[PDB]
UniProtKB/Swiss-Prot annotation, chains A, B:
Keyword Transmembrane attached: yes
The keyword Protease is annotated on this UniProt entry: no
Protein family: Belongs to the SLC26A/SulP transporter (TC 2.A.53) family.
Name of the encoding gene: SLC26A2
PANTHER family named among the record's database cross-references: SULFATE TRANSPORTER
GO cellular component: apical plasma membrane; extracellular exosome; membrane; microvillus membrane; plasma membrane
Membrane topology per record: Multi-pass membrane protein
Disease in which the protein is involved: Diastrophic dysplasia: An autosomal recessive disease characterized by osteochondrodysplasia with clinical features including dwarfism, spinal deformation, and specific joint abnormalities.
One term of GO molecular function: chloride transmembrane transporter activity
Record's protein name: Sulfate transporter
InterPro entries: S04_transporter_CS (IPR018045), SLC26A/SulP_dom (IPR011547), SLC26A/SulP_fam (IPR001902), STAS_dom (IPR002645), STAS_dom_sf (IPR036513)
Record function comment: Sulfate transporter which mediates sulfate uptake into chondrocytes in order to maintain adequate sulfation of proteoglycans which is needed for cartilage development. Mediates electroneutral anion exchange of sulfate ions for oxalate ions and of sulfate and oxalate ions for chloride ions. Mediates exchange of sulfate and oxalate ions for hydroxyl ions and of chloride ions for bromide, iodide and nitrate ions.
Subcellular location(s) of the protein: Cell membrane; Apical cell membrane
Length: 595, 595
């Protein structure tokens, strides 16, 4: 009755401006209020970046000298390539952990100097990771970073933070543990500590607890008392200078036996080519670090790009972190990526342009040239509690998402499985388990979908489900049915079983008829079925061929253009010279009422 | 205007009859027309099952005696447990290939008798595969067999058929090749043949070509001339008896040097316990064979169950193939599963009940007891062309699905990738690549979805897309928008970019406004968005917070009950004391027209 029929439809300086973005803000600086907040931000984050680089470089197994070349070349190389404004690419601790695992595995395998073979592997893997980044940037692909969610990175970071807390337990007591690195790394290292426990010092426990007692309440105050104290108070450099000038005026290496940092050379040695022969044995870890560095840096650039009102790209933001692993790779460095704490404390004070990074470079220079005879005779336990107490965020995350179970109910499971599988197993296998599980969970969400009868809406033409709404009039039998899943091959059985349960069953009624009623029309509302496979059109043909036997008819309701393509172009299913497919479900009710 | 508001809704003999199904058809046989077609079918498939069992048992590396125990115990054990009627569980050639690979790998590793150590590994892996089957049946799980599609098995079968055709090239020429088994098995075996080619016989090529010349046109006639010749004509036993009674009356082992499988003892040796110490090194191949045997047997039972008008179960069909690998596992056998050719030639003639299988057992008994001195002095090349020319179906499949590219366009890619990755690499890695690729392809289908404006339908209340339909009236600006994907985290960027491209862009217009119009309502039709993640409600909040800045408003249209749950229960997004969510999109047009 009044079948509404529509009609189908028939069938080069612009590059230099991109690549070298120092030449698009430097000729107009607008120095009225562009300098002072920027310079103060640069000195503040430089003061708060001195004690972090030595600690992170000590975490990777090397001496705390090469981390200064790492952070310095990283801060000076982003000023010439980066298109963001508030990122400050420095050192990310999870990258230091992965680099430490790789250089420890290769030094344990192929070695048996130590201090110079701990640089060849790191520089080579950072060089080839940058080669991978510039190849992924020259192909302009970037499609891999969208498969990493944001309830997956926030579990991987917490798992790697547990691994950092475990691997900084030797320096908190001053023991000599073997290289226990592999698949059960946290459990084996903790049982190695608790077996070999009755050998700890009385010098590497008193200064550790005293420095923790100074650090942790002061950071707890500094986190939420920023009103009367505008700049963040640098207690880290204060306790480092106070600990160095006790263990050198007080002779804390002969009277006791605490660990003491190397010697620290002048700096800026002649550059060296990385070892080409170690390339094919290490190019499974460049994949491991390049993807996560690229993902974290593009997410943390775009999150701060639209907050201040400008635009950033993605074919150039890849190249800056690409060459950040290329040109410093010829200068005894390791991998770098974006910041989390440093960029927030950078943007919180001043920070009107990119030139802060240059000052972030520049104050390192003094540190790298005239502070070589100092920073001797400081403990390796002060740096341990420095890189321990600076883990407030990745363990503050436990307070929120196990109480934000109410929003998602299925991202909490992904987050907790990724955290558990990255603290216990490793960092690479943990990230792989997280990615594959978050991919599998959407097809688990497709399987077992919802279904219900529909019914009317009392004097309009809307149809909403009767399993979750109050009194709606239903016709005696023109029973409607609605499926909210794609219906491809995983859930052909769920669709068949749900349709046979809500309405009557065809085969049982056919058997009891042959051994020797109401509901004379079923209207499948296929508005939500948003593609369909080969088995999809097979089971939609099967329900019609079964239901036509008893004496009832089946007619679909408001399919998409592509489903209506794949039905007629599909096998032959339901259209040669018949109507049997409608445009609105209320029209199907009006037709089936005419009988 | 007249906001249609509904109201939300507040919140033991029955087991023996299953397990032992010989006791539910045997007391009433109805012998008027239940015997004769059944018995003739049993003798016909027994005659056509004698030459196949020796060939398949020779494919697995063992003597052609243990295959007779395999098929006999398989046919006699399903009569006591099986609930189907037309399956006839015999020997599946891909199972013989996987068993051959496993016993060849273990015999090459741990060995260096050969004929008795080629039974311990096969019997042990079939025993533990049956243990896996009865464990998967006692847990009543069965959810794994739905992840295997039907455009995936039909590529895996063709890839394993290429591997059978390659691995039966030694016996087609009579050479001595080493065990070239691994990851590049087909390529290495073909290059080993074509390097070592100038050593073939003149006896193992003349009888091979002569027997192929007899077999292949006769099977080509027998495939589509079944009218005047009702029963399938058994030319296989005819050419086997004609080839045996040439190479024993004609002395074809002294005058030439062709291969001949002698020995062949009477049979029914005392039973032996399988080797328990080889359990933990082989339980990665029981997973490989149990899943595919269970999948093929449940699919081929249900495909023939509803064709004749009865019902079958799934908690009992698992147990029959479970114990088919348990009780014959103590009697020097290997794995069995359902039939494809044998069940079609069984059901095509006679076949009124299950008792055909007993005759399928019974005619083996004569073969296993008094045909021991015969079946000596037959070539190993006749059995080669027997198991070659019986591959008509799995290579006839190349004519259909590369011309059924028009139905699916994405199952052809899955099928071809599975065939290519199972012919070249292996059978296990090929099946794994097929399963993981078919899982990944549905989330590739979610990514890059369709979008369009809607427009009216000219004097009704339907809305269909304007990118694929002819003239529909559109309001000047109340531009509608429709998304047909779940919108979780993979395609937040596609949704944001498509909405910013079809309608106006918020951020660019805000920038040009701040440097110093039409479309005063966007109605997102979210009828097809069938769940949403945390990032989903984040980007749906972000589009409202952006669009509210310029001076236009955004209101969603006809979400599901679960999306309307996850919006309000979600963060706070859009409902405390506001309307901002409708029930039908035409009502949203009527509201936005009032302005």
């Amino acid at each position: 009755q009044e079948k509404s029929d529509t009609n189908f439809k028939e069938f080069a300086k612009n590059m230099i401006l991109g690549f070298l973005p120092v030449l698009q803000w430097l000729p107009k600086y607008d120095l009225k209020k562009n300098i002072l907040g920027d310079v103060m931000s640069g000195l503040i984050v430089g003061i708060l970046l001195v004690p972090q680089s030595i600690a992170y470089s000590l975490l990777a197994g090397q001496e705390p000298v090469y981390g200064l070349y790492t952070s310095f070349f990283a801060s000076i190389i982003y000023f010439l390539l980066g298109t963001s404004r508030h990122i400050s690419v420095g050192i990310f601790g999870v990258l230091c952990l992965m680099i430490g695992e790789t250089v420890d595995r290769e030094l344990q395998k192929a070695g048996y100097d130590k201090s110079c073979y701990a640089i060849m592997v790191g520089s080579t893997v950072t060089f080839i990771a940058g080669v991978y980044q510039v190849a992924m940037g020259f192909f302009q692909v970037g499609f891999v970073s969208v498969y990493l969610s944001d309830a997956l990175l926030s579990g991987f970071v917490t798992g790697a933070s547990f691994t950092i807390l475990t691997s900084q337990a030797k320096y908190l007591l001053g023991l000599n543990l073997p290289r226990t690195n592999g698949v059960g790394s946290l459990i084996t290292t903790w049982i190695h500590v608790f077996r070999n426990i009755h050998k700890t010092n009385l010098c590497d426990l008193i200064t550790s607890l005293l420095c923790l007692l100074v650090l942790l309440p002061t950071k707890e105050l500094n986190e939420h008392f920023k009103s009367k104290l505008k700049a963040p108070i640098p207690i880290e450099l204060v306790v480092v200078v106070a600990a160095t000038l006790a263990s050198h005026f007080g002779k804390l290496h002969e009277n006791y036996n605490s660990s003491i940092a190397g010697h620290i050379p002048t700096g800026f040695m002649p550059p060296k080519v990385p070892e080409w022969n170690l390339i094919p044995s290490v190019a499974v870890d460049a994949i491991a670090i390049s993807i996560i560095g690229f993902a974290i840096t593009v997410s943390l650039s775009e999150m701060f790009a639209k907050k201040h009102g400008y635009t950033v790209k993605a074919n150039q933001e890849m190249y800056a972190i690409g060459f950040c692993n290329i040109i410093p790779s010829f200068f005894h460095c390791f991998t770098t990526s974006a910041a989390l704490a440093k960029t927030l404390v950078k943007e919180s004070t001043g920070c009107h342009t990119q030139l802060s990074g240059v000052v972030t470079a520049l104050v390192l220079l003094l540190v790298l040239l005239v502070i070589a005879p100092l920073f001797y005779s400081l403990q390796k336990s002060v740096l341990g509690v420095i890189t321990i107490v600076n883990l407030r965020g990745a363990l503050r995350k436990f307070r929120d998402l196990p109480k934000m179970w109410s929003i998602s109910r299925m991202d909490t499971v992904i987050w907790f499985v990724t955290m558990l599988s990255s603290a216990l197993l490793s960092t690479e296998i943990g990230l792989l388990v997280g990615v594959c599980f978050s991919i599998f969970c959407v097809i688990l969400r497709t399987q077992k979908p919802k279904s219900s009868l529909l019914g009317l809406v009392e004097e309009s033409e809307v149809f909403e489900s009767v399993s979750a709404y109050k009194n709606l009039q239903i016709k005696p039998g023109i029973k409607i049915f609605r499926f909210v899943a794609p219906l491809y091959y995983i859930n052909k059985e769920c669709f068949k079983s749900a349709l046979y349960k809500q309405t009557v069953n065809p085969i049982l009624i056919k058997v009891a008829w042959k051994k020797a009623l109401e509901l004379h029309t079923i209207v499948i509302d296929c508005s939500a079925i948003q593609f369909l496979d080969t088995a999809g059109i097979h089971t939609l043909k099967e329900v019609r061929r079964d239901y036509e036997a008893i004496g009832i008819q089946v007619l679909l309701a408001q399919c998409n253009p592509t489903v209506r393509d794949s039905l007629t172009n599909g096998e032959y299913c339901k259209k040669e010279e018949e109507n049997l497919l409608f445009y609105s479900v209320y029209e199907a009710m009006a037709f089936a009422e005419v009988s």
